[PDB]
A paper describes a structure:
In this study, we probed the light-induced reverse reaction, from the Trans to Cis chromophore conformation, initiated with 2 ms 405 nm pulses at a range of optical flash energy densities (0.1–6.7 mJ/mm2) after the initial Cis-to-Trans photoconversion had been driven to completion using ∼13 mW/mm2 of 473 nm CW illumination. A total of 435,200 images were obtained across 6 laser energy densities at 405 nm of 0, 0.1, 0.53, 1.78, 6.74, and 14.43 mJ/mm2. From these images, 79,976 single-crystal indexed diffraction patterns were obtained and merged into 6 data sets for each corresponding laser energy density. Data below a value of 0.5 in Fourier shell correlation were discarded, leading to a uniform limit of 1.7 Å being applied to all data sets. The initial examination of the chromophore-omitted maps clearly shows increasing occupancy of the Cis state at higher energy densities.
Residue numbers in the entry: 2 to 61, 65 to 221
The structure:
Amino acid sequence: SAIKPDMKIKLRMEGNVNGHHFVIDGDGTGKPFEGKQSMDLEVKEGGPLPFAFDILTTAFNRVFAKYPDNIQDYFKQSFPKGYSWERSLTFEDGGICNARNDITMEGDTFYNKVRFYGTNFPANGPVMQKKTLKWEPSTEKMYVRDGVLTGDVETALLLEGNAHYRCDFRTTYKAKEKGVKLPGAHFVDHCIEILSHDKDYNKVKLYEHAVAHSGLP
């Protein structure tokens, strides 16, 4: 196993949401086999961010997910060469973006080159007014579509005032190494949370727990 029980995480995101440019650095640790990771995020340019930090967080690696013996682990088989993913997020009020991560490994560290581009968010909407509280726990449906491993998520951000703001993610995953065998269809349950933050979310601690299953208890 190229992958140790304790891996470090290094991360730089460059992005633009509704024109606003920003650069964010990440430093964290994770237990790939337990499906748990936590990282410290710091806005380096464009702070304070004039949009809800929450829209970024699923962009800050499915190598951190507990996979049972009876499901092919595409992600942990992708290393040490690594893999990329591209995501389109579609929000109920027309907000749309495209995120991509190119993930590499050097010794005991995952390096993440992340790009995040959002547009079409209404000025008066919860994202540009900062009314989001958190992502609800999700289930990612994994299946193969024209020879590409694809994950679908139908989820929502909880807003101030008991309201939900609906998300649809589609992610395409691709190993760098030709001939990493595709898995069969399956599910990954996700638990993403902001553990702490300063006034304007210039510093954020982020935690994710993920578990792969076939649908049964």
